[model samples]
Target: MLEQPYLDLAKKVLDEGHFKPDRTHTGTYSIFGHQMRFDLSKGFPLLTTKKVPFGLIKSELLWFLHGDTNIRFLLQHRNHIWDEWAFEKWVKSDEYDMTDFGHRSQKFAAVYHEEMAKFDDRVLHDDAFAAKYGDLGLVYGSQWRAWHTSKGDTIDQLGDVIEQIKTHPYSRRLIVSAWNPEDVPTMALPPCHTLYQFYVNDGKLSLQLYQRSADIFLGVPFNIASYALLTHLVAHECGLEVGEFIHTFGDAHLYVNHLDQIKEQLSRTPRPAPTLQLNPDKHDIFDFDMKDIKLLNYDPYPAIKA
Candidate 1:
C-alpha cells in the first residue's frame, strides 16, 4: 500500500506521458511535473512491488552523511554506485582512452570491464590513484556538507539545518541544497534531488525534496527510500517522530530501455511496507553507520533489472 503511488506514477507516465529524447539519447516517456508523498508512520517506504536493495541504500546514505566525495569509501563497502564516474575520470586523465564508452559500451565491453576492474582495484589499494581520480567534485556530499561560498568559505548546510530544526522548529529556512549553479558546467552529472526542506509540527518531522530530474523505473525507488531514511535520521536526531516524505519531481521520466521493466513492476501487487529501525544509542545522524540501521519485516518480490 505504501508503494501504490509509485506504481500509479509509472502507469500514468507510460499511458499518457510525452515521448521525448534525453541527453543519454535513450529517449523517455516523460512528464514535466509530479509529486508523491509517503507517510513514514505507516512504514519505511522501501518499494515492495519489486525488491529494492536496502543495503545499497543504507551504505549510500551513510556515505553521503559522512560528507565523503571519494568512491574509495563506496568501494570499501562494496557499493559500486559511483564507480563509473571515478572510472571515467581515470580513463580521461591517465592516457587510457575509452572515448564514447557510454554509447559503445557493448562494442568494447570486455576492454571496458577490464579497465573498470583495474580502476576499482587501484582505487581500493593505491592511495594516490584513488585520491587523484576518485573524488567527484561538488557532488551531493560536497554540496550538502561543504557548500562553497564566493568569499572562499564552506558552509555545512545539512549541519546548520539540523541545528535550526532543533533550535527553531518553526523556522521557514530549514533547507539543505545540493545544487550549485557555479559548479554545474564542470560536473559530469548535476544533482537530481536538488533541494529539500524540512517541516516540524506537532512533534513530528516531515521533509519535501524538489528533484530536478528523475529516472522513474530505476532511480525514483532509490530516491524515495533514501530521502525517507534521511527524514527518519534527522527526526531521530532532532528528538521528534517521523511524519512524511514528500517527493516533488521535475522531468520525471522512464527511459525507453526500461519500459518493459516498468510494465513488469506495475503488473505485480505491492506487499506490506517494512519498518525502519535505527540504533537508539546513536543520536547524531552523522554518526550512523551501516550496522546501526536496519529494516524490519521486509517481504518483497524479486528485483527487476533492466
Candidate 2:
C-alpha cells in the first residue's frame, strides 16, 4: 500500500494547522508545511515518483561521510541534481550572463568545459566576511562524520555510536548534529534538519530527526528518506533492530515557485512504497562503497527541477 499517512500529515498542516512552537524569536518560525513519521517495520521509507535515478542519496551521503566542502564531485555525477542552488548562490556560476534561468542552459550542451574548473571551490570565495564566511560543514554531515573544534580535538560521530551501543545502550543522549549556532555566519546556509537523537528499548533502536526548518518543495522528501535509511543502517550495525523513524521539522515552507509541481505530485495516487536494499553485511559507514544502496520498485514523475 502507498505510504498514505505522509499525505494525511501534509494536508493537516497545509489546511487546518499552524506549528508555531515559540514567539518573540525570528530564528525559529512556525512549522507551516509538513511532518511525517514512518514505521520502518513495514519497509524502508523512500519517495517513489518519476524514478529518481542515479543514486543522488547515495552520492550525497557518501559525500557527507568524507566531510567534504565542495559540490564539484556531485556536479560531475548529476549537473542539475544538487548544483541548482549552489549555482544560484554564486552569481558568477551561471556565466551565461543572466541572474536566473527559467529554462535549460547552454552549459548542458558541453559549453561547461570552462566552468568545470571553478567547480572545486564553488562553495567558497577568495575573500571572507563575518556575515557569511565559512564552508558547507555547518550541520548535518560535519557533525555526523567529523566535527573539528577550536579545542584541538576532532568529533567523530560515527565512531562514537559503536561505543555507545556497546557501553550504554540505554542512554537517551545518543544524539548528533552538525549545525553550530556560532558557525552560522560562515556558512551559505544553516542546517535545517540539524540534529538526530536515537533511542533503544527492548533491543529495538528508534530514531528521531529534529530539523529547524523544512524546505517542503525541494528538500523535505529527500531529507526524510535519507535520515531514515542512515539511522536504519546505524541501528543494524549497532546490533539492534530498526523501529520507527520519526521526523520533526520546524519552519517548513513550500517555495512560492513549487506550487504547480506540488499539486501534480499530490494528484499522483501513490504506489506501494519502495523497498531499500542495502548491502547490510557491511559495518563501518566509511567502508560503504556507493554500490551498497539501491531502491526497488521506485517510480515517480520527472524530478521537479528546483
Candidate 3:
C-alpha cells in the first residue's frame, strides 16, 4: 500500500495526462501539479512493486551529503548515475569525437559507451583528470552545502536548516533550495527537486519537496526514497520521530519509451514496505557512510529496463 500513490500517479498520467513533447525529444504523458505523501512510520517508501536499487540510492545520497561535486567519489562507490554529466564535460573540453552524446543513436551507442568507459577509468584513477572533468559544478551538493552568495561568501543551507530544526523547531524558515538560477545555464542538468522545507510538530519531523519536473517512471521512485532517507537522517540528528515525506511535483510525466515498463510495474502487486535501519551511533547526518544505513526486508519484483 505504501507504493500505491506512485502506481496511481503513473496510471493517472497514462490515462488522463496530456501528450506533450519533452526536451529529451522522447515525448511524455504528463500531468502538472501532483502530490504524494508517504508516512515514514508505516515503512521505508522504497517501491516494492519494482526492485529499486537501494545501493545506488544510498551512495548517491551520501555523496550529496558530503557536498562532493566530483564523479570520482561516486565511481569509488560503483555509482555511475552522475558519470554521464562529467563525461560530457570531458569530451567537450578535450574535443573528443562524439556527437549527440546525450541522445546518441544506436549507431553511436557502442562508441559512446567506449568513450564513457575511458572517462570513468580516468576519473577513478587520474586525480588531475577527475579534478578537471569529473566535477559537476553547482549540482545539488554544491547548492545545498556551499551556496554561493553575491558577496562571495558561502552559506551552508543544510547545516543551518538542521540547526533551525533543533533549536527553532517551529520556525517557518526551515528550508533548503538547490535551484540557483545563476548557475542553471552552465549546469549539465539543473536540479529537479528544486526546494525542500522541513516542519516540526508533535515532536516529529516532516519534509516537503517541490520538484519542478519528475520522470515519474524512472526518476520519481528514486527521488521519493532519497528524500525520505534525508528526512529520516535529519530527524535522527534532531532527536525527533519521523513524520511524513510530502513530495509535490510540477511536471510529473512518464516518458514515451517507458509506457510499457510502467504498465508492467503497475500490474505487479506491492509487497510489505521495508523498514530503514540507521546506525544508532551515527548522530550527525554528515558522518553517515554506506555502512550507517540499511534497508530491512526489501523484497520486490525484478527490475524493468526501458
TM-scores of all candidate predictions against the true structure? 0.97, 0.76, 0.97
RMSD of each: 1.2, 6.2, 1.3
Clashing pairs in 1: none
lDDT of each: 0.88, 0.62, 0.89
lDDT of 2 by residue, 203-249 (tens): 87788888887756567677777777777677767877877888877
* Model 3 Cα lDDT, one tens digit per residue, 60-176: 998889888889889999999988777767766844576556665454677777878998897789988778888888788888899999989998899988888989999999999
The reply for model 1, stretches above 4 Å from the true place, is none
Q: Which ranges in model 3 have alpha carbons more than 4 Å from their true place?
A: 105-108
lDDT by residue (198-221, candidate 1, tens digit) is: 999899999999998998988999
**Candidate 2: where are CA atoms >4 Å away?**
17-35, 49-54, 79-139, 301-306
Ranking by lDDT: 3, 1, 2
